Amino acid sequence: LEAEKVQAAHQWREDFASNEVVYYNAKDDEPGSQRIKPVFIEDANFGRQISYQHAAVHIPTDIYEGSTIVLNELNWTSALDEVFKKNREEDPSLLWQVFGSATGLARYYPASPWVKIDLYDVRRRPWYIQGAASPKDMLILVDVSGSVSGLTLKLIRTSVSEMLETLSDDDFVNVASFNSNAQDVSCFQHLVQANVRNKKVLKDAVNNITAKGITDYKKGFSFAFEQLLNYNVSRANCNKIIMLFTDGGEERAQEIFNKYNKDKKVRVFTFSVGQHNYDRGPIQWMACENKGYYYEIPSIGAIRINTQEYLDVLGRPMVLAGDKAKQVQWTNVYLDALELGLVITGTLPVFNITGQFENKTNLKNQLILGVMGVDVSLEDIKRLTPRFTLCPNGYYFAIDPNGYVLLHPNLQPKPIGVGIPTINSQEPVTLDFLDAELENDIKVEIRNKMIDGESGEKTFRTLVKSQDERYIDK
């Protein structure tokens, strides 16, 4: 609430030299921007040195402080320090509070210095994406025709592998390919839950594709629309989008768009990948008729940014909802970028409401300014469940409405494996309840009854495993 009010009152100015901005850059040991030197007193709870006097700012190595955009974002995001602190005295046990701006800079409190190559970007984090848009049903279309062979093929394989990192476990994905014949790239044949394991199969299968044949956009799009109308399998029943990874062409395929989505319930995002001289006219037409966007990826450097910008399009209906779209969501357990253990993050998007009282702006107000965030460490939750009054064989455990354990004696602060390691914080620790302990038939109905939010007791005999993984007891 204090972020929308301050931003609306902000006056866009382009001169910064005569009136400098003051802030603390996280990754430091400049006219137009003054820097602060903090005291950095050591404090408990956190495992580092923090200052409670101001909030730190993290700017990606690619983004540049000084841009009218960045410098403008560094003034209206300065009244946040007053409410960042005001939250702290009321609840002294408050952990990281972060505002992930859409520009790329994250302002978090309390101030703490940033942790080789810093590839962190606040717009790619799982807590940012889950609050920036509703769950989706993306199906990726990959052009594996002859003309994409060479450099543009390795750009496509990286691009597909880079956007699959923008999906959480609530989204459903599948990757297809057309080369005058449309087929899947993996053993799936339909939309999958896009968890840590399923995405690994798609990434591995995408890396093994070969470019040869004749392009055919009609067969590629018929397969794309058919797979989005299954309804036999579990799905998100939400944003249905199609990503087309091609270079260029001359085919519009307007008959397919007129047959499968007349009312335009399917967004089509088109990516033109690589450096070439083919026509990009039809590629832009599909992105405008269908409720989509047109992106260009000419090199490896443009792969990263262009693969998360499709989320501001998906957030347009969320903005127009108003106060009904402001509900706090909690992500899966994951490892904090600033090392703090296993944490979960609340989230709340913030809207652009300049001219709301005048009621006629509707120009950039359809986009979100950023996503808020507050972290809750699993240690705080475990303090609410006393254990020593119980026997050493009893314990508490709670799970997501997906089967993933929020807290469990088996859940360890270590990333989960997905296969055999080979040599020639980014991913959540998603451990299912049936994998945390031994799997029984009675414990499956217990798991389902807990997903549905019911309340019941059950006593039975089961197979438990000793603390060391060598014995079995009943």
């Binding site: 509703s134 609530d170 939400c238 590629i283 779209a325 997906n402």
Partner: peptide, 23 residues
Amino acid sequence: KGPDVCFDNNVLEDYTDCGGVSG
């Protein structure tokens, strides 16, 4: 069980901002 909230298909959406409609 998936989320019970869903936000898409709003009539008031601008619809007019592509990446090639300008350039």
